[PDB]
């Protein structure tokens, strides 16, 4: 009873290049309450030590946060972000498409 469906964007910090250290981000926004669970998957496998940014909200009271983790992209590995928030009857997963 404090809902607002979150918006998710997944992308690297630098233009990708197979075999090169880059940083993957999961930018989640427009959610309320601020309590949210974010997982960074690599081939459907939960990634450890995923750092989260400090929480800030916007003029519309909704909150936003940046989850990130270091990683080295390849040609076969798939990455994605899974978010569970009380405004979605189910967790939402979104894959990383290196051209977006």
């Amino acid at each position: 009873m404090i809902q607002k469906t979150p918006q998710i964007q997944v992308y690297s910090r630098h233009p990708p290049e197979n075999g090169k250290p880059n940083i993957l981000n999961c930018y989640v926004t427009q959610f309320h309450p601020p309590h949210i669970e974010i997982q960074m998957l690599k081939n459907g496998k939960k990634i450890p030590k995923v750092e989260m940014s400090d929480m800030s909200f916007s003029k519309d009271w909704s909150f936003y946060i940046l989850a990130h983790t270091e990683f080295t992209p390849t040609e076969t590995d798939t990455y994605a972000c899974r978010v569970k928030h009380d405004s979605m009857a189910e967790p939402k997963t979104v894959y990383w498409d290196r051209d977006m």
């Binding site: 607002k4 964007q9 992308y11 910090r13 309320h32 601020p34 309590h35 009271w61 990130h68 051209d99």
Partner: protein, 273 residues
């Protein structure tokens, strides 16, 4: 058109833990001080290099207001459950926004003091810094409480005084930093998005502040049709990103042109596949 805000949040959660209190301060949209009750040592801390000119008494002073607000939110959070007749096993959110906007002439344009419960407007001080606007039936009880205690004249004091006083003081110390910009770097990517057709994505990377504008044009008319644009995203290092694209008939790509408008470029970037 400088400004100063303090975004405060206190959320209650099931368990033995007291609600978390988080306050974030901003000067011209940039974070410069933050306070989290979940820290190992709750204290207001520097969030911009310029604030490191402030002595310990400043930090100790603000931190003490911090400590006070915590109780104020913890207590207020409790009064809300009563008003709304809610139960003890859930979680609630109480947010506050307050601050002052200054013109380029350093003159106060408007004061801000508003609160939300569960992410919905609850109560707000009007622009005359004298009367209140209460959103619902609960809000009415707070309005009366504050009208009888004469709260408006005291937030008004902070807004026309301390808020203006100190904000100038900050701008003075951090104008050199604030004014600082980061020119975007752009390039265009080609993607097979169809046969006979294709997709061109114009990338804008590592620019600061966030404000930017991307356009596409086939030598002449800007392509608003069939153009895709993404919300500006942070790169995680302070700078931001953004891209825009358009479907383009294969083999005709090098004829479309992209333009990047950002306040840090000696002039708008222009590129193509």
């Amino acid at each position: 058109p400088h400004s100063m805000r303090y975004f405060e949040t206190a959320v209650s959660r099931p368990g033995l833990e007291e609600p978390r209190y988080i306050s974030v301060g901003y000067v011209d949209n940039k974070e410069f001080v933050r306070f989290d009750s979940d820290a190992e040592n709750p204290r207001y801390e520097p969030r911009a290099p310029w604030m490191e000119q402030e002595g310990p008494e400043y930090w100790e002073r603000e931190t003490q207001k911090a400590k006070g607000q915590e109780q104020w939110f913890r207590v207020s959070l409790r009064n809300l459950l009563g008003y709304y007749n809610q139960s003890a096993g859930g979680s609630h959110t109480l947010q506050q926004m307050s601050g002052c906007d200054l013109g380029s002439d350093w003159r106060l344009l408007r004061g801000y003091l508003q609160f939300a419960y569960e992410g919905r407007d609850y109560i707000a001080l009007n622009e005359d810094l004298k009367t209140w606007t209460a959103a619902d039936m609960a809000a009415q009880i707070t309005r009366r409480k504050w009208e009888q205690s004469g709260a408006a004249e005291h937030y008004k004091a902070y807004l026309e005084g301390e808020c203006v006083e100190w904000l100038h003081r900050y701008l003075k110390n951090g104008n050199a930093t604030l004014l600082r910009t980061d020119s975007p770097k752009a390039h265009v990517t080609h993607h097979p998005r169809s046969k006979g057709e294709v997709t061109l994505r114009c990338w804008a990377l590592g620019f600061y502040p966030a404000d930017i504008t991307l356009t596409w044009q086939l030598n002449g008319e800007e392509l608003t049709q069939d153009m895709e644009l993404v919300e500006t995203r942070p790169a995680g290092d302070g700078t931001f990103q953004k891209w825009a694209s358009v479907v383009v008939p294969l083999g005709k790509e090098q004829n479309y042109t992209c333009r990047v408008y950002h306040e840090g470029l000696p002039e708008p970037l222009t590129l193509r596949w």
